[PDB]
């Protein structure tokens, strides 16, 4: 089993000399196929000048990852890893690695070239390789971005602008990052506008409805660990069809946000090549 | 015996990639293994017909126009299966009984047919893949009449 | 008759049997020896026969040509019915209650729908695998 | 010969731009269960996305127009968005055929 | 006859070994192959990572017997644990982020810098398929929610977080069980840790500052037969200690799953 | 011709190619023919069974 | 496909203004729309 | 562990009795024991048959059963194969639901479609073969949302009120297909799920940041949209907003809340088993990467 690509565009030797440096890469493929166009390669087919982040990962979640192997005349010899076997995956480069790190895929967010970014353009077309990042950096950058979708609604406060100035600088082993602002041109992204409502809606409905369901379980007794919780539910203080539809309006907002939460690992770091030019990893997913 | 009833199971109809009239478009070349053939490029030497009738007009070219083209490899893979519990009769080479002999030749035909149902039947996907690439080579006619 | 005019676009999925044509020697192909993948034994021992075939276009020009030809059978019903905008836009309602219920009495719609996951999901995911719902298609009116 | 027909469709900000167009449909609740054939004709996205493929693929055919005997050494092969456009041929131009 | 490839290779190795250099102050007891490796996320730049044995976690664990803690207190008095208590003990009810399981040892070299092989997947065993090394759980740490032996029990490493006293003293729970469905494993965890599920509410009743987190974390480690389960005895540096052995233990390191 | 003969797949299974001819001799022909028809290998001679 | 309905017709019996339209289906029965 | 499972029959096969099983080749078959030679009495979900007529209890008992793909009908035996982690094998459709490429699949207990094809496809002196559905993930979890909203809805209502929402709740719709769902109503397992559900709803209500819970009201005057008009009706019961708080606290106040977002949604979550790749044109077979 090997997956092939074809370049209908002519390949200048200067571009294939950068392409040979990609002995391996975590190239997404939307649909597994015996043969596929280069237009299907990368996240560039999903590129949007509007939605930005979140939609890039909600479409990336279904992508079939595949490593690069070898290159021939106007064609790529991609090879799909088997689960559990070791593979010499290339890094996307933002973060230096050390032994034992977890890894997971994230949408690209360039801040100039990354440590491993030889640009390759074939007439308007461009290849945006997905991030391979340690898991704690992914959960933290997701928290910073959802927090950016909260505070961006009211930019004007100097304490808030200093707040965004403080949270913008994530750090790691000799890292010096600066978080991109999703909310370009003042107006909120539609993805930030939806992801924030996905949590804030439950933040209101759970606060209003939590009493009625703990109520019937309060008179019942067992370990009675639940009965005490309502005393702190009271600290921050009637229709039938409204009670019906409202719960259906609850989980529909809760559920798509779970993709923003859970993030299955795809690789794990072991031995590290010098200057982090490559790293062996155990494929997963 | 209280009753009898008939049974049957046909062999698949034969088709060959070369016997087909689509093969005239093909120029197939058998080869051991696409391993050393790493380069996708393939050179050609195109001669150019000339009209010498012009007294003052010499052709600039010697009519030896090389032309490079590009190869396109394509996998040809199918799932296949056989019964090892029936294969053991092949492994053990029985000879002791006529009903054992019928059981042996039954095992031989059922396994040889099991390979025959995939072997030359793969040529259905070879003709299919050949259409997959020949259709890629073909522009729509609406482009061509204006072309 | 009001002051309105109502064009109605209608997608139709015709099925086609395209013609094909090609040159003589045209493309040439090269076939690999059939290497077989001996998958791990498990009584019912499946095997993966494999091959690779290369192709090159020996013809300098477009030796092949192709064009639409003949309809075998339309799969579209070729029916006509108005789009159910009350179902296309479930969330919308008149701000008045009895007025909206009287409108539902004439439209034939039951009651306004509860939130659907397709609404919140397509709110962030602009549709193009969603292009082929494979459902019935019908006229879409235009003022 | 007329510069335009319907103000309520061709003009920017018309009811069609706030109806079938995706950029204003997102303000409303909507479902993908009911495909709208005309929704492609009011998008600021799909129209430009198809037209850019058309204007680029046409020049890509014109690069292949001459025979190799007279043009520069080059392959001659279908352009991308060539065979793929066949399903949407009336609408790849957004000409609304027939 | 010719091209007898079968003669060329001596044995295959499905195990995914990795070579990790270790400080000499932690090699004690770790010299036995059956022990987990767990990278620690030190906040200091030099070094940001620090491998630790699972036994090193028991000097601070609450559920382990205090008499065993009196023995472990005399063991690791070196460059390792004196810094480990300086760092991981400082962590506010955070270990699953600080810690990272990395399988178990295959072999341990000596010297001032004790490099050691450690499989991250598959069986761990001596070279040439001779001796079969076995995993060694600390005695008191092992438990089973079902006293009946199962046909095949996966092992898990829950990390309980108590919130009773001002200074948290998290417990550590290796456990084998035939359960293989995380949706039910959290359900059997619901009624058993009633004091811990009460503790997660018990911080909100007192201290809104500092967020409470998990009552535990679950991740796959590997499977073992009930006949493979053992509770034997171990010696290193004369300080004898019985241990819960596991024989033919394949390694399958799943990711941590936080939950309340 | 054929992309590959059915004989070529046999060594990949490890079954000898001459072994089928050994079955052809062991069958005695008289049984091999009637079963070759019963299995449908020879449609021109086919009869319902 | 696309089709008009209800159009006024720019230029003693007077014209009757359209209010309905008819089409055809796969059955070839006269389709109704109004 | 074992790579394969075998079985033994009592009542003898006929032509149709073996043909219906050959029709089921390469299809999901749960087992509860994983012995090398399981008896047919232990085969299938029928061993969990319940005269009380439950459903959720069948699901929770189904949660621990091992899945094993069918293959090779040698005759008078099932010859099951044990799936390997991380690979792929072809899988026939069973549940009356259309499939699409790349969707996640999960195991769910069967329920009658309505018209009820009632094709047991196998029976003996009483024993049958009930194969659990393989269904797309959003359909697999939305029914859990229906059973959970059914549990919270049951409290403190008249029987006509108890069944008023049920006319919409038990008649789920998906891809033109419709399904009526018989329910346990109260089967303890729904109640213990309700206890951790409301316990999650309490902390999700309580871990919310003072600005995060207010964010809808901060957006309410900011914008005007019909989804917000639908948003607006739920929150209100019958304009000012505040802003404070140091930036650092949000990295904690949000972080622990994510664990509750899992713990609340975990109960409607189900473990994935299949990921379709090559859909068959006939809408029957479907190879799937990853297994149980």
Swiss-Prot record, chain A:
GO molecular function annotation: structural molecule activity
Subunit structure: Interacts with TRX1 and major capisd protein/MCP.
KW Metal-binding (keyword) present: no
Coiled coil: none
Protein name (Swiss-Prot/TrEMBL): Triplex capsid protein 2
GO CC annotation, single: host cell nucleus
Superkingdom of the organism of origin: Viruses
Annotated localization: Virion; Host nucleus
Keywords (A to Z) from UniProt: Capsid protein, Host nucleus, Virion
Role, per record: Structural component of the T=16 icosahedral capsid. The capsid is composed of pentamers and hexamers of major capsid protein/MCP, which are linked together by heterotrimers called triplexes. These triplexes are formed by a single molecule of triplex protein 1/TRX1 and two copies of triplex protein 2/TRX2. Additionally, TRX1 is required for efficient transport of TRX2 to the nucleus, which is the site of capsid assembly.
Homology family: Belongs to the herpesviridae TRX2 protein family.
Keyword Transport: no
Curated annotation (Swiss-Prot), chain C:
Subcellular location: Virion; Host nucleus
Source organism, top-level taxon: Viruses
Assembly mode: Homomultimer. Makes the hexons and eleven out of twelve pentons. Interacts with triplex proteins 1/TRX1 and 2/TRX2; adjacent capsomers are linked together in groups of three by triplexes, heterotrimeric complexes composed of one molecule of TRX1 and two molecules of TRX2. Interacts with scaffold protein; this interaction allows efficient MCP transport to the host nucleus. Interacts with capsid vertex component 2/CVC2. Interacts with the small capsomere-interacting protein/SCP.
Membership in a protein family: Belongs to the herpesviridae major capsid protein family.
Role according to the record: Self-assembles to form an icosahedral capsid with a T=16 symmetry, about 200 nm in diameter, and consisting of 150 hexons and 12 pentons (total of 162 capsomers). Hexons form the edges and faces of the capsid and are each composed of six MCP molecules. In contrast, one penton is found at each of the 12 vertices. Eleven of the pentons are MCP pentamers, while the last vertex is occupied by the portal complex.
Protein name stated in the entry: Major capsid protein
Source organism of the structure: Human cytomegalovirus (strain AD169) (HHV-5)
Organism placement in taxonomy: Viruses, Duplodnaviria, Heunggongvirae, Peploviricota, Herviviricetes
This protein's encoding gene: MCP
Residue window of the full protein shown: 1029 to 1175 of 1370
From Swiss-Prot, chain E:
GO biological process: viral capsid assembly
Domain of life: Viruses
Subcellular location: Virion; Host nucleus
GO MF entries: DNA binding
InterPro entries membership: Herpes_1
Primary location group: virion
Cellular component, GO, one term: viral capsid
The entry's keywords: Capsid protein, Host nucleus, Virion
Assembly and binders: Interacts with TRX2, MCP and capsid vertex component 2/CVC2.
Family: Belongs to the herpesviridae TRX1 protein family.
Task performed by this protein: Structural component of the T=16 icosahedral capsid. The capsid is composed of pentamers and hexamers of major capsid protein/MCP, which are linked together by heterotrimers called triplexes. These triplexes are formed by a single molecule of triplex protein 1/TRX1 and two copies of triplex protein 2/TRX2. Additionally, TRX1 is required for efficient transport of TRX2 to the nucleus, which is the site of capsid assembly.
Protein name: Triplex capsid protein 1
Lineage: Viruses, Duplodnaviria, Heunggongvirae, Peploviricota, Herviviricetes
Name of the coding gene: TRX1
Swiss-Prot record, chain F:
Subcellular location(s) per record: Virion; Host nucleus
Quaternary state and interactors: Homomultimer. Makes the hexons and eleven out of twelve pentons. Interacts with triplex proteins 1/TRX1 and 2/TRX2; adjacent capsomers are linked together in groups of three by triplexes, heterotrimeric complexes composed of one molecule of TRX1 and two molecules of TRX2. Interacts with scaffold protein; this interaction allows efficient MCP transport to the host nucleus. Interacts with capsid vertex component 2/CVC2. Interacts with the small capsomere-interacting protein/SCP.
Protein name per UniProt: Major capsid protein
Residue range from the parent sequence: 1 to 49 of 1370
Protein family according to the UniProt entry: Belongs to the herpesviridae major capsid protein family.
Function, as annotated: Self-assembles to form an icosahedral capsid with a T=16 symmetry, about 200 nm in diameter, and consisting of 150 hexons and 12 pentons (total of 162 capsomers). Hexons form the edges and faces of the capsid and are each composed of six MCP molecules. In contrast, one penton is found at each of the 12 vertices. Eleven of the pentons are MCP pentamers, while the last vertex is occupied by the portal complex.
């Amino acid at each position: 089993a090997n997956i092939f690509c074809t370049f209908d565009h002519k390949l200048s030797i200067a571009d294939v000399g950068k392409l040979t440096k990609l002995v391996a890469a975590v190239v997404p493929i939307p649909q597994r196929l015996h043969l596929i166009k280069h237009y299907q390669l990368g996240l560039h087919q999903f590129v949007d000048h509007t939605r930005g982040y979140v939609r890039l990962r909600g479409l990336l979640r279904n992508m079939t990852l595949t490593l690069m192997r070898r290159v021939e005349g106007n064609q790529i010899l991609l090879h799909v890893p088997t689960h559990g076997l070791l593979y010499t995956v290339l890094n996307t480069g933002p973060v230096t690695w050390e032994k034992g790190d977890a890894l997971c895929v994230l949408p690209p967010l360039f801040h100039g070239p990354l440590a491993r970014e030889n640009l390759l353009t074939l007439g308007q077309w461009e290849l945006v390789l997905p991030w391979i990042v340690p898991m704690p950096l992914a959960l933290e950058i997701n928290q910073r971005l959802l927090i950016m979708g909260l505070f961006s609604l009211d930019r004007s406060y100097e304490e808030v602008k200093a707040a965004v100035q403080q949270l913008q600088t994530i750090t790691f082993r000799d890292a010096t990052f600066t978080i991109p602002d999703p909310v370009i041109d003042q107006h909120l992204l539609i993805d930030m506008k939806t992801a924030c409502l996905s949590m804030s809606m439950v933040a209101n409905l759970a606060s209003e409805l939590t009493m009625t369901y703990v109520r019937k379980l309060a008179l019942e007794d067992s370990s009675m660990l639940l009965v005490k919780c309502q005393e702190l539910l009271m600290r921050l203080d009637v229709s039938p069809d409204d009670e019906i539809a409202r719960l259906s309006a609850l989980f529909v907002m809760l559920r798509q946000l779970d993709d923003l939460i859970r993030e299955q690992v795809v690789f794990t770091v072991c031995d590290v090549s010098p200057d982090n030019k490559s790293a062996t990893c155990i494929f997963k997913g | 015996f209280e009753a009898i009833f008939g049974t049957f199971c046909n062999r698949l109809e034969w088709v060959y990639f070369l016997t087909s009239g689509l093969a005239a478009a093909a120029h197939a070349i058998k080869f051991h293994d696409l391993n050393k053939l790493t380069t996708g490029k393939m050179l050609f030497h195109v001669q150019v017909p000339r009209v010498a009738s012009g007294a003052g007009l010499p052709t600039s070219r010697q009519t030896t126009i090389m032309v490079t083209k590009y190869s396109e490899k394509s996998p040809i893979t199918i799932p296949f299966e056989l019964s090892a519990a029936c294969l053991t009769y092949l492994r053990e080479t029985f000879e002791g009984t006529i009903l054992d002999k019928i059981l042996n030749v039954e095992a031989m035909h059922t396994v040889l047919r099991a390979l025959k149902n995939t072997a030359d039947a793969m040529e259905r996907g070879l003709i299919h893949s050949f259409l997959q690439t020949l259709l890629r080579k073909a522009p729509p006619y609406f482009v061509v009449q204006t072309l | 008759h009001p002051g309105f005019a109502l064009t109605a676009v209608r997608t139709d999925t015709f099925e086609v049997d395209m013609l094909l044509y090609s040159g003589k020697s045209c493309t040439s192909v090269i076939i690999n020896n059939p290497i077989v993948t001996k998958e791990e034994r498990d009584i019912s021992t499946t095997y993966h026969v494999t091959q690779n075939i290369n192709t090159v276009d020996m013809g300098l020009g477009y030796t092949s040509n192709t064009c639409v030809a003949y309809v075998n059978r339309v799969r579209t019903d070729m029916g006509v019915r108005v789009q159910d905008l009350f179902r296309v836009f479930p969330m919308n309602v008149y701000r008045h209650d009895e007025v909206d219920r009287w409108i539902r009495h004439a439209a034939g719609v039951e009651r306004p729908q509860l939130l659907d996951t397709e609404t919140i999901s397509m709110l962030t995911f602009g549709s193009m695998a969603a292009a082929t719902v494979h459902g019935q298609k019908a006229a879409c009116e235009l003022i | 010969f007329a510069a335009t027909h319907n103000p309520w469709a061709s003009q920017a900000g018309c009811l069609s731009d706030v109806l079938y167009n995706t950029r204003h449909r997102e303000r409303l609740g909507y479902n993908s269960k009911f495909y709208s054939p005309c929704a492609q004709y009011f998008n600021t996205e799909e129209i430009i996305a198809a037209n850019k493929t058309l204007f680029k693929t046409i020049d890509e055919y014109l690069l292949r127009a001459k025979d190799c005997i007279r043009g520069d050494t080059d392959t001659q092969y279908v352009c991308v968005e060539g065979t793929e456009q066949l399903i949407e041929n009336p609408c790849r131009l957004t000409q609304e055929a027939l | 006859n010719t091209i007898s490839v079968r003669y060329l290779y001596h044995a295959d190795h499905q195990a995914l070994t990795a070579r990790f250099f270790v400080p000499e102050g932690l090699v004690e007891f770790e010299a036995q192959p059956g022990a987990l490796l767990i990278r620690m996320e030190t906040g200091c730049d030099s070094p940001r990572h620090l491998y630790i044995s699972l036994y090193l976690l028991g000097i601070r664990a609450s559920n382990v017997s205090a008499s065993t803690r009196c023995l472990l207190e005399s063991v690791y008095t070196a460059s390792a644990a004196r810094a480990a208590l300086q760092w991981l003990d400082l962590g506010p009810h955070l270990l699953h982020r600080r810690l990272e399981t990395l399988g178990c040892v295959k072999t341990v070299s000596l010297g001032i810098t004790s490099l050691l092989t450690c499989v991250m997947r598959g069986y761990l065993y001596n070279t040439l398929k001779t001796e079969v090394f076995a995993l060694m759980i600390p005695k008191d740490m092992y438990l089973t929610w079902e006293e009946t032996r199962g046909r095949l029990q996966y092992v898990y490493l829950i990390i309980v977080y108590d919130y009773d006293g001002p200074e948290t003293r998290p417990g550590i729970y290796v456990l084998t069980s035939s359960i293989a469905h995380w949706q039910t494993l959290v359900d059997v965890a619901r009624g058993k840790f009633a004091r811990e599920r009460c503790s997660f509410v018990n911080r909100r009743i007192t201290r809104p500052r500092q967020i409470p987190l998990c009552t535990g974390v679950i991740q796959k480690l590997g499977w073992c037969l009930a006949d493979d389960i053992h509770t034997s005895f171990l010696v290193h540096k004369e300080l004898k200690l019985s241990v819960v052995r596991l024989d033919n233990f394949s390694v399958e390191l799943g990711d941590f799953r936080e939950f309340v | 011709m054929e992309n590959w003969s059915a004989l070529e797949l046999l060594p990949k299974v490890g079954i000898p190619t001459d072994f089928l001819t050994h079955v052809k001799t062991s069958a005695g022909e008289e049984m091999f023919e009637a079963l070759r028809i019963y299995y449908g290998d020879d449609p021109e001679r086919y009869n319902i069974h | 496909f696309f089709f008009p309905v209800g159009l006024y017709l720019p230029e003693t019996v007077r014209n009757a203004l359209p209010t309905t339209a008819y089409l055809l289906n796969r059955d070839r029965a006269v389709q109704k729309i109004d």
